[PDB]
């Protein structure tokens with residue numbers, strides 16, 4: 001199993017691409033821009049990082065993970081001077097489809113089923129598995145980092161952003177972080193709100209209460225709940241591993257999971273004014289778990 005190493009280009013990227021000023025993101029450590037291949041017109045995205053030890057680590061680890069069908073692909077990396085500062089410029093496959101939960105929030109029908117949730121979870125679990133197998137922990141798995149290739153309902157989900165990723169030899173438990181994220185995302189996919197604690201809106205979870213409230217959880221099986229409790233286990237020493245997760249009947253036979261109708265889409269709309277807080281709660285939480 002032998003892969004090629006990263007070969008950073010030094011020529012000006014503007015020899016190869018038309019670079020616009022429209023900012024497709026204010027990501028973890030750079031900004032993402034819209035660009036076009038000069039000779040093919042084909043669309044791509046560009047991540048700019050000021051060159052430095054962290055930026056070199058993100059790029060390297062992202063390069064190792066690139067060929068995974070559920071991680072955003074790296075096309076090339078340039079080292080250039082950009083507006084007076086030294087940069088790593090990363091050209092990436094273009095990810096048009098929007099973020100994971102915007103798509104679901106926007107479903108016309110409010111017709112999201114448990115089986116769809118399963119299939120999505122399988123996609124994210126494959127990315128984590130690719131990484132964990134080569135001893136990388138992503139450590140930033142969360143909503144804004146999960147994007148679809150295009151707007152086609154047949155679009156592929158891709159994990160992005162290696163700004164917190166690290167190598168994990170000697171340090172197994174660094175991976176638990178990613179598992180906890182799977183649990184949170186799974187939980188949100190099933191009901192439309194995070195399993196978190198805390199004005200004009202419904203309170204989804206009272207402080208300290210049983211974690212699966214009846215209105216939204218009553219038709220979800222105990223089996224699925226056990227799987228969630230395993231992913232959310234407080235102690236990293238007891239939390240489910242990516243191997244156990246990918247061997248679970250609910251993930252393994254995702255396409256034979258019941259099509260139970262879910263509240264998710266409807267809850268995401270009603271609670272939309274709270275989304276940013278949900279993302280913020282998750283981001284802070286991650287800062288203390290990684």
Ligand SMILES: Nc1nn(-c2cccc(-c3ccc4cc[nH]c4c3)c2)cc1-c1ccc2c(c1)CCNC2=O
Pocket residue numbers: 024025026027028032033034035036042043044045047072092093094095096144145147160161162
């Ligand atoms: N690969 C990507 N494509 N788009 C994306 C998102 C929205 C529109 C377009 C887009 C849309 C049209 C055109 C035409 C030329 N280029 C285009 C790009 C591209 C965004 C990303 C991306 C890349 C890196 C990160 C993130 C997102 C999230 C945060 N952290 C990251 O590290």
Ligand SMILES: [Mg+2]
Pocket residue numbers: 065066067068069070071072073
């Ligand atoms: Mg890929």
